[PDB]
Design a protein around this ligand. Structure first.
Ligand SMILES: O[C@@H]1[C@@H](O)[C@H](O[C@@H]2CO[C@@H](O[C@@H]3CO[C@@H](O)[C@H](O)[C@H]3O)[C@H](O)[C@H]2O)OC[C@H]1O
Ligand SMILES: O[C@@H]1[C@@H](O)[C@@H](O)CO[C@H]1O
Ligand SMILES: [Ca+2]
Ligand code: NA
Length: 330
């Protein structure tokens, strides 16, 4: 049956989260986390998110029937991974398809790995080790118009980004939150140009600067605006749009810049808070319309770790501003 017409759950037979939507072969392919009711301890490090595989979804139209392509990747087959298959993304280059995924290694440190297929629907063969120089969570692999591909990544608190300031992991007894210096600039998300073969980074990882309208850095204490997790990049009318979740304040916000590396100027809210703690999205153009894919905990009756993906139309103004979406109005 067709789905996606009135902000209803796109699938109900499994729980799904963190949707990364792409247009491949004229279809919408969605790469979400597959939530399961593991019953693991709930805490601020996210141990309650205990996912173990990925399913690829696809739609030929929006609204449309949603196809579940089965298990695209299983944690048991990822040689380096210990636990926790968190928010993934995919990319397409030269007829190969790449699934990028955050997981904890055997030392309980989040890294980002890649798995490879000849189909957007998978299944995918994981590389034996994670990407060298990767860390933390929430990859978004963005193809710019010039054919260059960039990985945006990072998440604070349970995502461990705050433990990576030196290029080496600070340890399990290091900060559980952020820099703990609210008058310093907030931690920024990470970017690296991808290698030609899509398996590695082509440069040292860079941190992205996010500033306010006056050009001042967004500060660590500004939880309404500062980066938490779920980075996403899209381009519209020559402008680069870095969008992301603010975590404990539950917004998807966006900031604009003139190149992939920023700096990005905070503009406003994309998506107001949903049912359930997390808020995670993607923004994609399909048949000349822009869509926001997102999730909530509505299907599970409000369980933060049992989510369902949804979609709605997103409206850019010609001046580059985006109309804020409030999820439960209309
Ligand atoms: O890595 C991320 C985790 O850090 C993130 O953990 C959430 C942190 O907040 C938790 O909710 C708090 C519970 O205590 C109340 O008093 C506070 O007001 C709440 O904010 C929430 O349950 C955790 O999920 O989850 C997402 C991960 O990506
Ligand atoms: O990586 C995501 C994170 O952004 C948050 O949504 C919790 O679930 C994880 O899968
Ligand atoms: Ca994502
Ligand atoms: Na707004």
């Amino acid at each position: 049956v067709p789905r996606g017409s009135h902000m209803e759950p796109l699938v109900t037979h499994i729980y799904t989260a963190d949707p990364s939507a792409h247009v491949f072969d004229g279809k919408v392919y969605i790469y979400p986390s597959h939530d399961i009711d593991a019953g693991t301890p709930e805490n601020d490090m996210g141990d309650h998110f205990d996912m173990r595989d990925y399913h690829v979804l696809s739609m030929n139209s929006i609204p449309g029937e949603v196809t579940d392509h089965g298990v695209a990747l299983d944690i048991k087959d990822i040689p380096w991974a210990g636990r926790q298959l968190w928010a993934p993304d995919a990319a397409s280059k030269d007829g190969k398809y790449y699934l990028y995924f955050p997981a904890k290694d055997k030392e309980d440190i989040f890294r980002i790995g890649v798995a490879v297929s000849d189909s957007p629907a998978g299944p995918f063969k994981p590389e034996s080790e994670p990407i060298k120089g990767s860390y933390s969570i929430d990859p978004a692999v963005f193809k710019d118009d010039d054919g260059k591909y960039y990985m945006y990544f990072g998440g604070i608190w349970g995502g461990q980004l705050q433990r990576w300031t030196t290029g080496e992991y600070a340890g399990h007894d290091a900060s559980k939150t952020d820099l703990e210096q609210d008058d310093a600039p907030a931690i920024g998300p990470r970017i690296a140009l991808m290698s030609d073969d899509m398996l590695s980074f082509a440069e040292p990882v860079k941190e992205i600067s996010i500033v306010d309208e006056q050009g001042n850095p967004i500060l660590g204490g500004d939880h309404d605006r500062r980066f938490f997790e779920a980075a996403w990049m899209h381009k519209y009318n020559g402008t680069y749009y870095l969008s992301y979740s603010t975590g404990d304040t539950h917004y998807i916000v966006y900031a604009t810049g003139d190149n992939p590396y920023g700096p990005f100027t905070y503009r406003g809210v994309i998506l107001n808070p949903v049912i359930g703690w997390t808020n995670h999205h993607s923004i994609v153009e399909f048949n000349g319309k822009w869509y926001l894919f997102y999730h909530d905990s509505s299907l599970s009756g409000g369980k933060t770790h049992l989510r369902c993906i949804k979609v709605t139309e997103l409206t850019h103004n010609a001046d580059g501003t985006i109309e804020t979406i409030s999820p439960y109005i209309e």
